[PDB]
Each structure stands twice: as structure tokens, then as C-alpha cells.
Amino acid sequence: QQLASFLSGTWQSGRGRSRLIHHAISGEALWEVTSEGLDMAAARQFAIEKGAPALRAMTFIERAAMLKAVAKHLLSEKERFYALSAQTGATRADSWVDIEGGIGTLFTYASLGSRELPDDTLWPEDELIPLSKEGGFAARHLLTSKSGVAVHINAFNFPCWGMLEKLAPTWLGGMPAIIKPATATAQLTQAMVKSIVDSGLVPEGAISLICGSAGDLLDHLDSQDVVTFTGSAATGQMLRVQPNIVAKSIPFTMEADSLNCCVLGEDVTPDQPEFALFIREVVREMTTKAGQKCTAIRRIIVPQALVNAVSDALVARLQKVVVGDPAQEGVKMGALVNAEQRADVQEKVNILLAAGCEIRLGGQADLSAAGAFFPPTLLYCPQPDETPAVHATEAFGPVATLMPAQNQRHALQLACAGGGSLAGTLVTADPQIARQFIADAARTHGRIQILNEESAKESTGHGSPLPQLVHGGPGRAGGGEELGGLRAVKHYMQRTAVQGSPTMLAAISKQWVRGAKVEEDRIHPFRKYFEELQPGDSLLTPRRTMTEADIVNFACLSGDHFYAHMDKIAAAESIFGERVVHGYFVLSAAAGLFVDAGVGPVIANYGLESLRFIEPVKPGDTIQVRLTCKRKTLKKQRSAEEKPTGVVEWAVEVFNQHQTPVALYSILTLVARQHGDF
Amino acid sequence: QQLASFLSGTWQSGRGRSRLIHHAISGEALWEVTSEGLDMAAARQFAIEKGAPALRAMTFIERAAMLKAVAKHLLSEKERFYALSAQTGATRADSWVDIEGGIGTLFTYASLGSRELPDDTLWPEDELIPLSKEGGFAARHLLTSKSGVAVHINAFNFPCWGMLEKLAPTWLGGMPAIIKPATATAQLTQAMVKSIVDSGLVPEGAISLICGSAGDLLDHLDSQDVVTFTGSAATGQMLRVQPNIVAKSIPFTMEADSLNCCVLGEDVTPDQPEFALFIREVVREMTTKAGQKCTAIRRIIVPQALVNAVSDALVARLQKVVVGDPAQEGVKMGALVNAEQRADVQEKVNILLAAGCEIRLGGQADLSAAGAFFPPTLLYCPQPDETPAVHATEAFGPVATLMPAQNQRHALQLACAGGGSLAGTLVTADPQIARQFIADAARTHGRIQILNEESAKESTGHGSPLPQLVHGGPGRAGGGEELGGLRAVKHYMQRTAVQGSPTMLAAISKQWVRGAKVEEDRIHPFRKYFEELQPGDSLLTPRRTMTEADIVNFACLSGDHFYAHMDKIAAAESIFGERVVHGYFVLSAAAGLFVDAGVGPVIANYGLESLRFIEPVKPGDTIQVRLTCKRKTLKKQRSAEEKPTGVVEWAVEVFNQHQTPVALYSILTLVARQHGDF
Amino acid sequence: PGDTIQVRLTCKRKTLKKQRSAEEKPTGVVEWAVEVFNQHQTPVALYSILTLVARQHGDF
């Protein structure tokens, strides 16, 4: 039964050398996978010529909506993916974390994209940077989608989450994706790809899949392509030195095997709840996914005195875990994905034992059984500082080593001795211990969780990588970063400093910037609908003279009698030298000047972005307000009856009678739209 | 005369194979450089053991102050550097751009560090990310200094700017630097290093210099080290595939040769000022530094009709440039740095001519003269789309090629055909042309300037890389990024997502976060000095009942009679369903509730960071304010008489009678300090 | 209290004023009818205001 790969817009399979996908439980070969003789250059060309322009033509809002629609479509058909994930030897809980994590990642990226990405094909990331005394020359940073292709090479650990976690920012960045999943679990990935292709929610060529060898795809890539890799250190190190990749300076991101630690604080004792939740956390991370998650705990660092206690409390809890076929009731842990994986894990355990380690709970597995089952294994290292192999060798299975520490600094040294890790946990109740541990060991771990009684109530766990947080680490972990929210998007884009006149930068950004040309229409901007508004549509308001009465009345009404406003004697000795107008009164008076009272397209204010008071305002000063449309962001209608609205940001500039700016800030608004989009 | 290298805290030179530094004008060998037999592992160990902890112990404010002090010290001794830069064959203008650019970079990084980096050894980059319904589990990103060493390998182009542009963010990131300058101009770099070492403003081992070969330093590096490279593509590609670098996943940044373009818009005509300033820009970039700056213009893309005009206007302007010894009056352009450089430039010119190019102004140089002089050269390509060598070969000298374009899209294709560039210029007056050009060609250029009449008045130039903007580009440009303001700092740090209870994250960050434990002292927080304040010091204010009178009075005083507040009929048909209290009145009433009136440590408000109105406030609702100290930032005294002040950020949470948060924002304040620091 | 007022302002009459000199600002008298209604559209106030409005073109 050939596993088809989707490339050049067609489902096709290769001929020649084939690799077998076996059922993890049954042991029967149920797929064979090959891509020999398929034209990889044609696949790349197809993705570039039509997928990439179609994605680039879409705005970020449209791409976020496409992600949301794809997330809903995939969620509707989750049962198929559950059935196919059962073939990988994962329980319902493991399939839940994989599939729902993937779909949750898509939802989260869609929400983030909708909330805080521009309604444009270009992304101005920062505010204008002044570079001249007159303000005739400035610059700002843009992010533009790369015109090439993103090549994602995934591991077998998360066939579905591992795809969508890279696919969501790749698509949100406007880049077509070619996905090369790990062979061992490729059959699952294909199914989701099929769904997406059959959804008709994506442009043609926006997604391609290669089942089997990548052939010579990496030899056909150019400067505008990117490569992401997850798997063994050796394979990624081989790919990093690819002559074509190094010649064209192609961005290459690698995530590799990591020795994730779990440090027990010296403040905790067996009587504390911290002890119990530490044992529970370690066992959960060891047993979930048969410890085949890249964030599973491999090293357990505990105080010397506590060792003999912990070694008991784990084993008993680790004894209750039942390893078997997840279909039958009473199994809480499945099997590994492959017999080859089991042999590898056994080899790693044997290496650790040969390098001075003691079995606390069984490390020998049956290397003749049809199922790829491995018993929960706990090892012990009496000399952690004299055994380097415990800090270099990791078993990609339900295997962890516990080691003693002293004086809370030896623990930090042992945590840092990993040579770089993806995740770390410290279990403590003392804030100072947490501070010291982070300050000394965050440089070697990409994620650290401080687990206490308060956190454990709703903690998503040590091993679950959330889409709002970075997934990566230095050194042995590979040196990549992923899933850092919008950070990930910026890996599929080119950052360009654009210099020039503010007017030119405003036109380039399709956002008004300080010092740019404005349009005054003689129609008040708040009376215009979202569609009639343009960035640069501006109003110069009537003036208002600030009086001593204004200071007194605002201080009375607000209750703020701060000495700088209401005490002459003290204000004489202040930096200003006399009593001044309240900053918030300047803001309030400005609002009075520019706001149109009538019922209109403006729905709500709801926001104020970045307020600085530059110059004091004195009685007898006269303020004037320039109100300019800065940025427009359409909001997709969540239903059919909802009022079609858009987010409009307005730059407000408040000047005095000398035209010197006294207040500069931005307000957010909701403006009603004439035309909806269901 | 041996050129000493500063490593292991000592000035020392090597023995054996030596390379000669010649005077660019005279041609006499005046230095010889060698580092054979010097212990590179000892240098690395020395930098790591004492330089790195000493830098890491310092806060960002202290490190910014160290940068500022070093900048002032270097500026005091600039004449020595001018005299030594004269030996490199650079004019006073070129030496000015190099030395003052370097010192300006140091000043700018110091200012940026002082303004917007925390008063701590850790850097929380973002706001708290909620990850639970109760708010018991959250996460935020920290940046921590790497414990290793930064190895900077620089080019001969900017011996001093090229060092300081990397040194300023490396030190601001808390990382020791080992600098390997290009041999050809190493004598200049050494001098500045000497000054720094002799300043006593830096910790011991915070800076090392290697003059000559790097030996086997790259074989001794670990996961916590970083490498930056500038120079030829071949050398950087060789370094990228170093077995030790690829094994330990050591961050490697490369900047390589780029074919910087200058596109002339189709809207411009010879009668327009745009034409003149285009000619002036192209000639300036060609002639400055004898075109040895990495951002010099190499390709000139002009409309077909304009070609014969431009080809004339350039040549005449290019004829007036006098090439000779800069010491004698009437030379506006110096020589190249080396005879080897001259031979290389001549070889590249000959390659271009062999690949179908025509001389418009002389390309043949005297390869027997003592001085490394090269005449200003202008070439012409009749078939730009049929000659690939014009889009791959660059001459690192005063050489540029002009080529025709058509229909404004062929120009964009030719600009993108460079395969990635550091800088690009478009000369135009039409905003739509600028928009199209950016939208289609920003993905292949790291910096683009739109040059018009308005910009040219104070434009710093096409070739000058400013410290607030990114310096880098994809593909042929190397794929690095540098000088992106604080972005650069983050390349020398590890980004770690820290998860846990808000209380633990507040302790870890030394900044109060939403939902964390607070301290109520029964002393009002505004009455405490900066030193007595702690993040988490909080006050729960008295309550104030919002009334219809309050709405009317605030609308009257401010002048804002928006229908949502002052019209019952319209407010009935709004989303809220009845008239509500002004958001700014909620803000003003909150200020009245928490502000202490008395003369005290609080000096000014000056700021409001991020305001969102979550829930409407109705008449008969009662508001209460929780005011908490969020972040403290000490300000270094610029003089001895200045009042010692610090920036304190306060989180303000305004609730209604149901304890539901109606306003969440942050205010900035200046708080006086008891103890100054001169 | 609790009534909501709305105002219709309409130009009622225009009366040009002859310039007495050459430097005087050319102005005209404009009368405006003001109608103030409540939420039931029942008129609660009816009156006229006088105004001086500047002219673009004078007549010496």
C-alpha cells in the first residue's frame, strides 16, 4: 500500500528503495514509503511560481483567517487522525496532546495574527526612528515575506504538532512550505496534508509533502529559501554543512536531542506538597508518550539527603504504570514507534550502565516481542561530576537518571553541565532559590518552569511546548528557536531598514508616520467610515487656552492635588519653576478638541498606546491638536450578524502657541465598516 | 617593529611566519604581524574565568555607563587614531567617518542602554503572558548573558568602526570579546584596544586582541561562545563548516560582499533636482573610501532613455575627482589599502570586461606604482539580463557598472538579480514607485533608502550604516544582521521562556507582574525614596463612586460630549446599552485616588505606557485602585550637581465593586534618590 | 431631567452690509432660526439669533 506524496499539485509515489512503516503494537508492516525518481526541482518551482505569489498577495488578516478556517476544518475531522495516531503506539492522552496541540497552535497563531499584525502585505515592526534635526530624514524597519520556500524536516515525535507548529508561522509569514516528515510516522502527517489540500481553504502550491528521502532538493534551493530541521544531532550537523546551503547562506534552524533536567530545591522536605508534585511531574514526563517527547525529563537532580527518599517515592509510583496495548482498558502508557527505536534506547541504556550507572527500576527490554514496548526505566549515578557520559548520552524513551547534589550550587553546575537543554524544571517554594537558579542556568536552557503548589493547579506541564513561548535551546539542543509567538514569523521574513523622507516612509508602510504629508478634507475624520479613511487623513482642531481655572477645576474634579499643580510655594522650587497644567487634563482637553460628538462610524475609544509629556503646559498657554489617521486594521467578522468593524489607530499631537509639541501619543478606535464579509 | 596582540591580560607577539603591513601611499613595509605559538585556549580561558563574571556582575546601566566613559576616553584621544588612519591611505573625511562613526556607535548604544534596558543582570523583554483561567500559571521571556566569549573577525574596510559596532552590543550584552582584525589594517585596531586597556574603565579580560592567524581558537570554543565574521564569501563559508563550530551549534554570523544597487525612477527627468542628487549620490558612494566600504554602489540601474544622459553626467563629475596622496592639498580621494587589493580589483574589472562590458571611464590601473592607487572606473553593460557575471562579480574598489532598464519592472528584476545586497537606493519623487520597489525588492536588500529632494538635505548617505538600523542582508550579503539597535544585543544573549506562578516570575524578573504577591507597608508608596522602594510595594486606595454628575462635569470640563456619555437615546442603541463614564475620567479619578499631594520623592509623572479599557463603567459603579511598583531603573548622574533620580514604572489596576478589572495600565515616574553617584 | 434636547439650526435671512470705507471687513447680517426639541420631537424652544458673517468679496 504505497504512501503518496503531494508535490507539483499532484499525489504521486516513487519507485525503487522503500522503507517500511510498521504498526507499533501489532508489529505488521502496513505502509512502505519511497520518493525515488520524483522531481524535487519541479516541486520547488511549482511552490515558488504560484503558491508564494498567492500567499504574498494575501494580507496578514486574510492569512490569519485562512489559518483559523484550516484549524476549524482539521478540528471537524480529528477522529480520523486519532484512529491513525493509534497506529503509532500512542494512547488517547498522547494523541490528544499531539492533535489538539497542533490545532491549538493554529488557533493561537490565527488569533495573534488577527490581533497584532497589519492589514497589509508588509509588516512595519517598530515606530519611526528620527535621524535628522529638521525631521526631513528618518528610517523604520519593515518585514517582508521571502519569495522562496520553507523546507521543514520533522521528527517522528509529533507527526501532526511538529508539522503545524512550523506551518502556522510559515504561512502567516507568506511563505510556501515543503514538509519532509520522519518516515516512521509519515502516514499520520500525510492524512492532515490531504485534509488541508481537500479543504480548498489554501492557495494551490501553498503546501507540499515529501514522503521518504529528500533526494537532491537541498541542492536546488536559493537565498530566499529557509530550512528547519528536527531530529538526531548527526543528521542536522550533516545538513548544516551541505555545500549548496552554505554557499547561498540559506537560513538553517536545527532542534536536536536535549538532556532536560529537573532540579529539586534544598528548601523542600518530604512533608511538603512540593515533594509530591515533584514526584508526580517527573513520573508524568517520564511516562507521557513513552518518554518520546523532546522535552521529556532525562536528568533528575536532587539533594543528597533526599536521594534515598526520592528513589523510593518514584519507584513505587513508577511501579503502578501499566505498559501495554492502549486499546485494552487499564494501560496508561503505550509503546515506542519502532523496533529500531527500541534497540537504540536499549543501546543508550547499556552505554549509560557501562559508564558507571546502577539500575533502580528495570532497564532491560524484550528485543524479540512484536510490539515496541520498553518498561519504565530509572537509573542512578553515584558520581555525577566524575561521569561525563551521563551529561552527553540521552535515551529517547522512558529512561531518566537521578543524581545527588550538594549546597544548591553543585545542583546548578550539574544543570548547566547538560551542554544546553530544551526544557528545565525547578521545584521549590523559596523565591531566592528560583532567582539564583534562573540567573545561573537560564543561559543553558530555552525553557525553565518553576513548579510550586500555586503553579501546579493549572500548569500545562514541563513537556508541553506552548505556542506563545520559545521552543529551542543552545548547544546540544541545536541553537534554534521556534514557536516564540510572532518571533517565529520573523524567521520566515527579511528585515529591511528603509530610510528616506517621512512622506515616502508613510507611503511605503501604508501607515502615517511623524512628519509625513497629511490630507485635510474639510470633513471631520470621525464622520468617515473605515473604507473612506486613509492613513494621513488629518484634522487641525480649534485652540483652547489653558487657564488657572482649568488647573483648579481639573484638580477638584479628579481629586489630584499634586503640589506641581495646586501649590505655588512648592512649584516655585520645582524643576518647572511655577505651577503647571495636569498632563491628564492636557489629554482630556485634547479629547474635547478633536472628538466629534455626533453618532457616527466611531464606536469606541477603548485604548491609548504610548503617551509621553515632553514640555510642561503653563496657564496662559494655548494648546492645539493635530489628529491624524496612523494605521487601519480590518477585523474579520466572527459571525453573519456582527457589526463589521475595524481598528483605527490615531496619532495625536498637542502643541502650544509656539508650535512646540507638548504631547505625543496614539489612541485606538473601533470604526464601523460599510461592507461586511460574513 | 612587531605588532603586539593583547591576550591573557598581557601584550605579546608570535614567532615564525609573518605578514607585512605596508604604507598605502609610501608602499614601505612598516609593520609585520604574527601570532604563531600564542596560547589561544589560555586566552579564551582567561576571558571566560574573570572577564565574563566581571561583566555579568554589572547591571545594564553600569555597562552602558562603561560604554559612555569608553566613548569619551576614545574621543579625547582621536588625533592618534587620525594619524594612524592616514597610514591606511584614507583622507580626513574617510578617517572622520570611521573613527567618529565608531565613537558615535558607542555613544548611541550607551544612550539606548541607559534609556530602555533594566537595572538588573537579567532582561525581561516582554509583558507577562497569562496561561491559565485563575492566573496561577503564567510565563515570560528573559534574556540572559551567555557565559562564553564573542569572537569577532573583522574586515580591513573599517578597522575602528568595524570593531566598535560589534564591541558595543557584545559588552552591553555582558559578553567578553576576542577581536581578530584584518591584518592589512590591524595596526589601527590595536591602538584603540591599547587605549581601552590603558583607560582602566573596563574589567580585566573584557577585551582581547589577536593580530595575525587565529590558530586553533575555533577548535576550543563551546556552546556558550558566538562567532561574527566580516570579509570574503569564501573565508566565511570555510569558517561556517568548521567541525567544532557545527558540532557545538555555535552561533555564527557572516557579512559578505554585496552588489549594492542604485535604481533611478522612471518618473524623473534631467530637468528635475532628483537627477542631480542621484548623480551626486552615486559619485559620492563610488569615491568615498576609494569605494572600499561594503555598502558602496556597484550596480547602477537607469531607464534606457536616460542612459546616454547619465553616462555623460557621471563621467564629467567623475573626471573632477583627483586621486593622490591625501596629505597634499587638492586630493578628494585616497588609495586602496594594499597592492594585493589593487591586483584583486584589477582582476575583477578584467573579469567583468571579459564577460561583455564596455569601459566608460578608465578601468586600467598602474600595477607597478608604489602607492595602491586605482583611478575612478565606470563600466557599461549593454545586456544586463543576458550577462550573469555582472550580477555575481563585485570589484572591491572605485568601480561601478551602469545598465539600462525598461517599464520599471525590469529595473526591479535587475535589482533582485543581485542575489541579496547590504544596501540599495531608489531615487524618485512618486510614492507609488517607492511602494512597488520596496514591496518587490526589500526581501533581497537589508537596507533601502528612498532619496528625494526632501531627504537629501540631511541624509547621512547611502553607504553610512547607522547604529539604530540593521546592517546585513540575505544570500550573497551573508545572511547576518548587526547594529539593529537593541536587536544586536539579543544576538549575544539566550532567550528563555520562564514559566511558573506570577509570584515566582516577579521574584525572578525583579519586576512585579500581574497576579503576584504584593507588600502593603501602611506608608504611602509615593512617600518612599527610590532606594526604599521595592517591586511589589503596593497601595489599595479608598473607593470613589461614579455618578451621573461626574459624567456631566467631566464632559463639561474636557469638552468631550461624545454620544456614549452625554446622549441617553443614542447610548440606548449602543453596544453598552446605557450611557457610561469617560475612560479618561476613570484614568483621572484613579490618579486622584492614588496620588499623594505632598512634596515628596516623586518628581514628575511624564508618562503612561499601555492603557486598555476592558469593561464599561456606569453611574452608580464604585471604582478602586491598586497601585503597585512594577519596575525600577536608576539613572546615572550626567554631572555632580544634578538631582539623583530614577525611573519607576507603576502598574495601576482599576476595579469596579465586583472586583472585575475595568482599567489596566502603567505610569512612568521620576523618583528622587537619597544617594548620588557623581 | 432625563429629557434629551436636539437643535435644528437653519439660516433664515441674509442682509448684506455696504462697506462704509475701503479698509472695513465686508460683513453681512445673517439671522438663524434655532429649534430645540425634546426626545418626543416636540419643540421646547423656538427663537432667532443674529450673526455677523464675513464676506469673500467687498464693494469699497
Residue numbers in the entry:
A (entry chain A), B (entry chain A): 2 to 679
C (entry chain A): 620 to 679
Provide the authors' own sentences about this structure as they appear in the paper:
Two of the others were essentially at Nyquist resolution (catalase and glutamine synthetase at 3.4 Å), with only PaaZ and the 70S ribosome at 0.9 Nyquist.
To investigate the performance of the microscope in practical biological structure determination, we chose eleven macromolecular specimens with different sizes and symmetries to show that the capabilities of the instrument span the full range of molecular structures for which the single-particle cryoEM method is ideally suited. We determined eleven structures, with three having four identical molecular subunits, three having twelve identical subunits, and one structure each having 1, 5, 6, 24, and 60 subunits. When compared to the range of atomic structures determined by cryoEM in the PDB in recent years, we can therefore conclude that the system overall works well for nearly all specimens amenable to single-particle cryoEM. It is notable that all the structures were obtained with a single day of data collection where the number of one megapixel images in each case was between 350 and 500, equivalent to 20-30 images from the current generation of 16-megapixel direct electron detectors in use at 300 keV. The resolutions were all sufficient to build accurate atomic models (2.6–4.5 Å), and a majority of the structures (7 of 11) extended to beyond physical Nyquist resolution, indicating the power and importance of combined detector and optical performance.
